[PDB]
Design a protein around this ligand. Structure first.
Ligand code: JJI
Ligand code: Y01
Ligand code: JIZ
Ligand code: ATP
Ligand code: ATP
Ligand code: MG
Ligand code: MG
Length: 1177
C-alpha cells in the first residue's frame, strides 16, 4: 500500500527510526541556528568594519577596544560554532546509522520472506507466470526498496526540520523579506512531486526492461549447448540487445530529465539570490534591516526551501522504492490454495496403499481450454503394481502430478484409503510419495547431497543401500571423489542413464509408500533395466507403484495394466487378460588480482563518444571554475555593506551584482545541463556497450567454460547484471564531480590566495584531514566488496536452482532446505551491511562536523588577521567561502571512493571476460569451408577426457566409419561414450589424441560454424525455449527466416503436426520454460522437427524416440526412411527396434568398439548384441 512499507520493523527498528528521526530533526535544526550565529557575527563584525569612516580619528584605545572587543565577541562566537560541531557529530551518526540499521534489519527480513512466498506458490502459479524474472526481482527490486527506506528517509526529515527551522528563524528575524523568498518555495515543492513521479515511473519502466533482459540472458545461458549447436549466438545476442536498447533509451531520457530538474534547481537558487539581494535596499534605509540580519534570514529561508527541493531525489528514491515494492509485496500477499507450508491437515498414522481416482476431470491452468482428463477412473490396491500405457499426451504424467497434489482437479475425487487428499496435509502427503519424473533433474551439488535431498536425515549406509538398489553403486565407486563428485547444473556432467539412476536412489532413500515412476528406465540399457526392475520387485510388498513406461519389458510383470485413450481408462487388466483383448496394448505388443587502472580501461571504451568526453569536460571545468567565482560575488555583495560607507556611494548603484547572479544562473543551464547530459548519456551508452560485449563474449566461450562449477546459470546472470550495474553506479554524476570538484577546489587555490593568503593555509590542513577520513573507510572496508561480490553470486545460485527447478523441489519437499541455504548465504552480506552502516554513519558525521569546526577555526583565525590589520571581512569571507566548501567538495570526492573501488573490482572482471579468447572460437570466420560435402564421417583413434574429470578416460582410441546414405547405430551400456562422440562431431570439445574426419578433411580445419551448420542434432534431453511452438521449430536454421510451410512440413515429418493443429492457438502456442508445458513425447517430436527443418546432411539422434510411443516412433522412422538417401544418420537408442534396420550397428562400451557388423551378423554370433536381444524379449 502506502504505509505498509514498514510491516516487519519490530520494536528494534521502530526505535531506530524514532530516535533516528529525532536526531535527523536536531541535525536539520542546526543549520537555522548556524545562520543565526552567522548573521549575528556578520552584523557584530561589520561594527568594526567601515572603521575606515573616521579612520584618521584614533583614540587608539577606542580602536584597540574596537578590535579587542571584536575578538572578545568573536571568541564567544567560535565557542557556539564548536558546540554545534560537537553536537552534530553525535546526531548525524544517529541520523544515518540508525536508519540504515532499520533498513538493513527489514530488507534482510523482506528477502527471507520474499523467498518464502516464491517457494510457497503453487505449480500453476509457476506455470502461468514467467518465473525467470523472479531472480532479477529478488536481486535488484528488493535493492530498490533498500535504497528508499534507508538513510535517505533520514535525510528527508532533516530537510523538513531545516524548512521548519527556516520558517522559525525567518519569522523571528524578518517579517517582509521572508515571504519574498517564499515565492519560489511552492514552485520548488510542486516540481519536487512532479519530477519525482516522472522519475519513479521511468524507474519502473527501466526495471521492467532490465528484468526482461535478465530473463532473456537466463534463458539463453541455461540451454547454451542447444544455442551453440544450432548457431543461435547472433539471434540471442540481438534479443538481448533489444532489451538493452529499450532500457538505454529510457536511461538517456532519465538522465536528461534528472539533469534538467537539477539545472532548474540551480536556476532557482540563482534567482533566489538575485531576488533576495534585490530588496537589499532595506540596508540603505536605516534600521529596517541589518546586513547580518539580511544574510541570516535569506540563508535560513534558502537552505530550508532548497533542502526540501534537494530532498526530491530522496523522495524520488522513496518514490523509486514505491515504484518497485509492489511485485515484491504482491507475491508475498498472494496466498496459494495448495499451501505446502500450511500446518493444517490430517496426518494419518497407518496408511494402506489404496489409491482411488473417481471421475477425474483436469485442465492445466496455462491451457485451460483443453481437457486433459475427462472422467478418469483408477483403482490401486495395496501391494500392487499398476502400469499406465497409452499414446503420448494421454495424461499419464498428468495422473502422476495429480497424485502428488501438484494441481487440484477441476472436478473429481483423488483419495488414499478413502480419504480426501485435500484434507490430508500437503507436505505430509508428499513425504510418503517418492517420485521419479520423466526426465529426472539433479542439482548443482555432489551425488551424495543430491541423494540426501530425498531425506535430509539419511545415513551413508542407507545411501549406499539405495544406490545398490538403483544399480548406481558401480559407476559411483568407479570415478574419483566417489559420492563427493560434483555433477553439473541439472545433472549435466553425467550420462543420461547415470542421471536417471541417481534420481531413482533419491526417491528410494525416502522409503516411500507411493512410488510414482514416470519412464524411469528410458535412458537405461537392457542390463541396468533388469537390475532396477529386480530391485524394485524385491521390495514390492512394502509399497504400491504407479509405473509409466513405453517399453514393454517393465510392464509385462505388472499386477494390472491401465490403457489411456483420450483421458480415460479404456482397458484395465493383467498382461494375460489384455493379450487376448485385441486392444491398444495388443497393438503395442505387436509393434515391439584487480589492477588499479581497471576503471580507466572501461572509460576507454567511450573513445567513439570522445566529443561527449571533451565538451563535457570543458563544461565541468567551467561549472567548477565558477563556483569559486560565486564566492567572489557573494563577498562583494557582503562587502558593499560591511566595508561600504555613504549610501550614495555604491549601495543602490551596486545593483550590477544581481545582474551577475542572473547571468551565472543562465550559465548554470548552459554548463550544468551539458555536463550532466554528456555524462548521463555516455554513461548509458557505455553500460549498454559493456553488457553487449560481456554477453557476446559469454556466448563466444567453449562448452568447457560452462562446465566449470563457478559458471552456473544463476552465477552467470548475477555476474552479468551486477558488474555493469556497479560500473554504471560509478559512471555519470559521480564521474562529473571529479572533473568539477577538483576544479572547484583548484580555482579557489588561486583566487583565495590573491585576496588573503594567511587564512588559505588552513586549507593545507583541512583537505588532508577530510581526506584521511575516506581512507580509514576505504582501508577498513577494502576487501568486503570482494566478499560481497562472490557471495552475491552464491545466493543467486540457490535462488536460480530453486526457482528454475521448482517442480523437483516441491516433489521432494525441499523448499525449507532451500530457504535455509538462502538465509545462510545471505548472512555474510547482512553482516557486511550492518558493519558498513556504522562506518558510513561515522564518516558522514565527521565530514559534516568538520564543516562546523571549520566555521569556528576560519572565522576565529581571520579575526586575528583583522586584529593585525591584514585582512577585512570581504577577504576573510571570500577565502572562507572558497576554501571551506572546496574542502567539503573533496570530502564528497573522498566519500564516494567506495563506489570507485566497487567499479574497479567490477571493471577488472568485465575487461577480463571481454578479452577472453575461446580455444574453439565460434565467431571466427578463419576456416576452410568446403563447397561440396559428401557426408563421410570418420573417427580414427579418438581419445577424449572431459575437462571437469580429466583423470577419467572416456574414449580409448575409438575408430568408426559412416558413409553417405548409411545408418550407423551406437549401442552399449550407460556411460559407454555414445553421447560423447555426438558431442565430438559438433566440436563441443577437441579430442586429445585421435582424429575426426569429415569428407576426408579433419574437422579441426573446417570452420566451426560451417561444420555445425550441416549437423542436425537431437539431444538425449531435448530442451526447448520459452517461445512459440513454431519458433522452436524455426530455430533449426538461424541463418535464414523459415517459412511457415517449411515448419509445417517439418512438423508433419516429426509426427507432431496433428497435435499442434488440434491444439488451440495452433503453432503460436507458447510452451513453458525448457518445454515443461509439453509431454516428453511432444517435446521430443518438436525437437525432431527443429532438427529436420534444417534439412541436415548429418542427422545425429541421441535417443530421439525415447519418450515416443510405438505408433509415433513408427511414423517418425518411416518418415526418416523415406529420406534415407542424401544424408548420413548416426542414431543412439536403447530399444532394439530402431537399431534393427540400421546399415551398421556398433557396441560402444568402455570407449571401444567391440561388436561390429549389421543386425543379422551380430545377432547370429553370440555376444553382447545377442546379450541385449535375449533379455529384451
Ligand atoms: C558552493 C558553495 N557552498 C555550498 O554549496 C554549501 C555546502 S554547505 C552550505 N553551502 C551551507 C548551507 S547547505 S547547502 C547544500 C548543498 C548541497 C546539498 N546536497 O547534498 O545536494 C545539500 C546542502 N544542504 O546541507 O542543504 N551554506 C553555508 O554554509 C554558507 C554560509 S555563508 C556561505 N555559505 C557563503 C558565504 N555563501 C555562499 O553563498 C557560497 C559561496 S560558495 C558556496 N556558497
Ligand atoms: C557517536 C556515538 C558516541 C553515539 C552513540 C553510539 C551508539 C548509538 C552505537 C555505538 C555502538 C552501536 C551498536 C553496535 C552494534 C550493534 C549490533 C547490531 O546487531 C546486528 O547486526 C543485528 C542483530 C541484532 O541486533 O540482534 C545492532 C546494532 C548495535 C546494537 C549498535 C546500536 C547502536 C550503538 C550502541
Ligand atoms: S540558499 C540555498 C542553498 N544554496 C547555496 O547556499 C549556494 C550558494 S552557491 C551554490 N549553492 C552553488 C552554485 N551550488 C552548488 O554547488 C550545488 C550543487 S548541488 C546543489 N547546489 C543542489 C541543487 N542544491 C542544494 O542541495 C541546496 C540546499 S540549500 C542550498 N542549496
Ligand atoms: N505444464 C503443462 N501446462 C500445460 N499443458 C501441459 C502441461 N504438461 C502437460 N501438458 C499437456 O497435457 C497433455 C498430456 O501431457 P502429459 O505430460 O500428461 O502426457 P504423458 O502421457 O505423460 O506423455 P509422454 O508419454 O509423452 O511422457 C498434453 O497435451 C500436454 O501438452
Ligand atoms: N559434461 C561432462 N563432464 C564430465 N563427464 C561427463 C560429461 N558428460 C558425460 N560425462 C561422463 O562421461 C561418461 C560417458 O557419458 P556419455 O554421455 O558419453 O554416455 P552415453 O553412452 O551417452 O550414455 P547413456 O546410454 O546413459 O545415454 C560417463 O562417465 C559420464 O558421467
Ligand atoms: Mg509425460
Ligand atoms: Mg547419453
Amino acid at each position: 500500500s502506502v504505509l505498509t512499507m514498514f510491516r516487519y520493523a519490530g520494536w528494534l527498528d521502530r526505535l531506530y527510526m524514532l530516535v533516528g528521526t529525532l536526531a535527523a530533526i536536531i541535525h536539520g535544526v542546526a543549520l537555522p541556528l548556524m545562520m543565526l550565529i552567522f548573521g549575528d557575527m556578520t552584523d557584530s563584525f561589520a561594527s568594526v568594519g567601515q572603521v575606515s569612516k573616521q579612520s584618521t580619528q584614533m583614540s587608539e584605545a577606542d580602536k584597540r577596544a574596537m578590535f579587542a572587543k571584536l575578538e572578545e565577541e568573536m571568541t564567544t562566537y567560535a565557542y557556539y560554532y564548536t558546540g554545534i560541531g560537537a553536537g552534530v557529530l553525535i546526531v548525524a551518526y544517529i541520523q544515518v546509522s540508525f536508519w540504515a540499521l532499520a533498513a538493513g534489519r527489514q530488507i534482510h527480513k523482506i528477502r527471507q520472506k520474499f523467498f518464502h512466498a516464491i517457494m510457497n506458490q503453487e505449480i500453476g502459479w509457476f506455470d502461468v507466470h514467467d518465473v525467470g524474472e523472479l531472480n532479477t526481482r529478488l536481486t535488484d527490486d528488493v535493492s530498490k526498496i533498500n535504497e528508499g527506506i534507508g538513510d535517505k528517509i533520514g535525510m528527508f526529515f532533516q530537510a523538513m526540520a531545516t524548512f521548519f527551522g527556516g520558517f522559525i528563524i525567518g519569522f523571528t528575524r524578518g517579517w517582509k523579506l521572508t515571504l519574498v523568498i517564499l515565492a519560489i518555495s511552492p514552485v520548488l515543492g510542486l516540481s519536487a512531486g512532479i519530477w519525482a513521479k516522472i522519475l519513479s515511473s521511468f524507474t519502473d519502466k527501466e526495471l521492467h526492461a532490465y528484468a526482461k533482459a535478465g530473463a532473456v540472458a537466463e534463458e539463453v545461458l541455461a540451454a547454451i549447448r542447444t544455442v551453440i549447436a544450432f548457431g543461435g549466438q547472433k539471434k540471442e545476442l540481438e534479443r538481448y540487445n533489444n532489451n538493452l536498447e529499450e532500457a538505454k533509451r529510457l536511461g538517456i531520457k532519465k538522465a536528461i530529465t534528472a539533469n534538467i530538474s537539477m539545472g532548474a534547481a540551480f536556476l532557482l537558487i540563482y534567482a533566489s539570490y538575485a531576488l533576495a539581494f534585490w530588496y537589499g535596499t532595506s540596508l540603505v534605509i536605516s534600521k529596517e534591516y541589518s546586513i547580518g540580519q539580511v544574510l541570516t534570514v535569506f540563508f535560513s529561508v534558502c537552505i530550508g526551501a532548497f533542502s526540501v527541493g534537494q530532498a526530491s531525489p530522496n523522495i524520488e528514491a522513496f518514490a523509486n522504492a514505491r515504484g518497485a515494492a509492489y511485485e515484491v509485496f504482491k507475491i508475498i500477499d498472494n496466498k496459494p490454495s495448495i499451501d505446502s507450508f500450511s500446518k493444517s491437515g490430517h496426518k494419518p498414522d497407518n496408511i494402506q496403499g489404496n489409491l482411488e481416482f473417481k471421475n477425474i476431470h483436469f485442465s492445466y491452468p496455462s491451457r485451460k481450454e483443453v481437457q486433459i482428463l475427462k472422467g478418469l477412473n483408477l483403482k490401486v490396491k495395496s501391494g500392487q503394481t499398476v502400469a499406465l500405457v497409452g499414446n503420448s499426451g494421454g495424461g499419464k504424467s498428468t495422473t502422476v502430478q495429480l497424485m502428488q497434489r501438484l494441481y487440484d482437479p477441476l472436478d473429481g475425487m483423488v483419495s488414499i484409503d478413502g480419504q480426501d487428499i485435500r484434507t490430508i496435509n500437503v507436505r505430509y502427503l508428499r513425504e510418503i510419495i517418492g517420485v521419479v519424473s520423466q526426465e529426472p533433474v539433479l542439482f548443482a551439488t555432489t551425488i551424495a547431497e543430491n541423494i540426501r535431498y530425498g531425506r535430509e536425515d539419511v545415513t551413508m549406509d542407507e545411501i549406499e543401500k539405495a544406490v545398490k538398489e538403483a544399480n548406481a553403486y558401480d559407476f559411483i565407486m568407479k570415478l574419483p571423489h566417489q559420492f563427493d563428485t560434483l555433477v553439473g547444473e541439472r545433472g549435466a556432467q553425467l550420462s543420461g542413464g547415470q542421471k536417471q539412476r541417481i534420481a531413482i536412489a533419491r526417491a528410494l532413500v525416502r522409503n516411500p509408500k507411493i512410488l510414482l515412476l514416470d519412464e524411469a528406465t528410458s535412458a537405461l540399457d537392457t542390463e541396468s533395466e533388469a537390475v532396477v526392475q529386480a530391485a524394485l520387485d524385491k521390495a514390492r510388498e512394502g509399497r504400491t507403484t504407479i509405473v509409466i513406461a513405453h517399453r514393454l519389458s517393465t510392464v509385462r510383470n505388472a499386477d494390472v495394466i491401465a490403457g489411456f485413450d483420450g483421458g480415460v481408462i479404456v482397458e484395465q487388466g493383467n498382461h494375460d487378460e489384455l493379450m487376448r483383448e485385441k486392444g491398444i496394448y495388443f497393438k503395442l505388443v505387436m509393434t515391439q588480482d584487480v589492477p588499479p587502472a581497471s576503471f580507466w580501461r572501461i572509460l576507454k571504451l567511450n573513445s567513439t563518444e570522445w566529443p561527449y568526453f571533451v565538451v563535457g569536460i570543458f563544461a565541468a571545468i567551467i561549472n567548477g571554475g565558477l563556483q569559486p567565482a560565486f564566492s567572489v560575488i557573494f563577498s562583494k555583495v557582503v562587502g558593499v555593506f560591511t566595508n561600504g560607507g555613504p549610501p550614495e556611494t555604491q549601495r543602490q548603484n551596486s545593483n550590477l551584482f544581481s545582474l551577475l547572479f542572473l547571468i551565472l544562473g543562465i550559465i548554470s543551464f548552459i554548463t550544468f545541463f551539458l555536463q550532466g547530459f554528456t555524462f548521463g548519456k555516455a554513461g548509458e551508452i557505455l553500460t549498454k556497450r559493456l553488457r553487449y560485449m560481456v554477453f557476446k563474449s559469454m556466448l563466444r566461450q567453449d562448452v568447457s567454460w560452462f562446465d566449470d562449477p563457478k559458471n552456473t546459470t544463476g552465477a552467470l546472470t548475477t555476474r552479468l547484471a551486477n558488474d555493469a550495474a556497479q560500473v554504471k553506479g560509478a559512471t555519470g554524476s559521480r564521474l562529473a564531480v571529479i572533473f568539477q570538484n577538483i576544479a572547484n577546489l583548484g580555482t579557489g587555490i588561486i583566487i583565495s590566495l590573491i585576496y588573503g593568503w594567511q587564512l588559505t593555509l588552513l586549507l593545507l590542513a583541512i583537505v588532508p584531514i577530510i581526506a584521511i577520513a575516506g581512507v580509514v573507510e576505504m582501508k577498513m572496508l577494502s576487501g568486503q566488496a570482494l566478499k560481497d561480490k562472490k557471495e552475491l553470486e552464491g545466493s543467486g545460485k540457490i535462488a536460480t536452482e530453486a526457482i528454475e527447478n521448482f517442480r523437483t523441489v516441491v516433489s521432494l519437499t525441499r523448499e525449507q532446505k532451500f530457504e535455509t541455504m538462502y538465509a545462510q548465504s545471505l548472512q555474510i552480506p547482512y553482516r557486511n551491511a550492518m558493519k558498513k552502516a556504522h562506518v558510513f554513519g561515522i564518516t558522514f558525521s565527521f565530514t559534516q562536523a568538520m564543516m562546523y569546526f571549520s566555521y569556528a577555526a576560519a572565522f576565529r583565525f581571520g579575526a586575528y588577521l583583522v586584529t593585525q590589520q591584514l585582512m577585512t571581512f570581504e577577504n576573510v569571507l571570500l577565502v572562507f567561502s572558497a576554501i571551506v566548501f572546496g574542502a567539503m567538495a573533496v570530502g564528497q570526492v573522498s566519500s564516494f571512493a567506495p563506489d570507485y573501488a566497487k567499479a574497479t573490482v567490477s571493471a577488472s572482471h568485465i575487461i577480463r571476460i571481454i578479452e577472453k579468447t575461446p580455444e574453439i572460437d565460434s565467431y571466427s570466420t578463419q576456416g576452410l569451408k568446403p563447397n561440396m560435402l559428401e557426408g563421410n564421417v570418420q573417427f580414427s583413434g579418438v581419445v577424449f577426457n572431459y575437462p571437469t574429470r580429466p583423470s577419467i578416460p572416456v574414449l580409448q582410441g575409438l575408430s568408426l566409419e559412416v558413409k553417405k546414405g548409411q545408418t550407423l547405430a551406437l549401442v552399449g551400456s550407460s556411460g559407454g561414450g555414445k553421447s560423447t562422440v555426438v558431442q565430438l562431431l559438433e566440436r563441443f570439445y577437441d579430442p586429445m589424441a585421435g582424429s575426426v574426419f569429415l569428407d576426408g578433411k579433419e574437422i579441426k580445419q573446417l570452420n566451426v560454424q560451417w561444420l555445425r551448420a550441416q549437423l542436425g542434432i537431437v539431444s538425449q534431453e531435448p530442451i526447448l525455449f520459452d517461445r512459440s511452438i513454431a519458433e522452436n521449430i524455426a530455430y533449426g536454421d538461424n541463418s535464414r527466416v523459415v517459412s511457415y510451410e517449411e515448419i509445417v512440413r517439418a512438423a508433419k515429418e516429426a509426427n507432431i503436426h496433428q497435435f499442434i493443429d488440434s491444439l488451440p492457438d495452433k503453432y503460436n502456442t507458447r510452451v513453458g520454460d525448457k518445454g515443461t508445458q509439453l509431454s516428453g513425447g511432444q517435446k521430443q517430436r518438436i525437437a525432431i522437427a527443429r532438427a529436420l527443418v534444417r534439412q541436415p546432411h548429418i542427422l545425429l539422434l541421441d535417443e530421439a524416440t525415447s519418450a515416443l510411443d510405438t505408433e509415433s516412433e513408427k511414423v517418425v522412422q518411416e518418415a526418416l526412411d523415406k529420406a534415407r538417401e542424401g544424408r548420413t544418420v548416426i542414431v543412439i537408442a536403447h530399444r532394439l527396434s530402431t537399431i534393427q534396420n540400421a546399415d551398421l550397428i556398433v557396441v560402444i562400451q568402455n570407449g571401444k568398439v567391440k561388436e561390429h557388423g549389421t543386425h543379422q551378423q551380430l545377432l547370429a554370433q553370440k555376444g553382447i548384441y545377442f546379450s541385449m536381444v535375449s533379455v529384451q524379449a
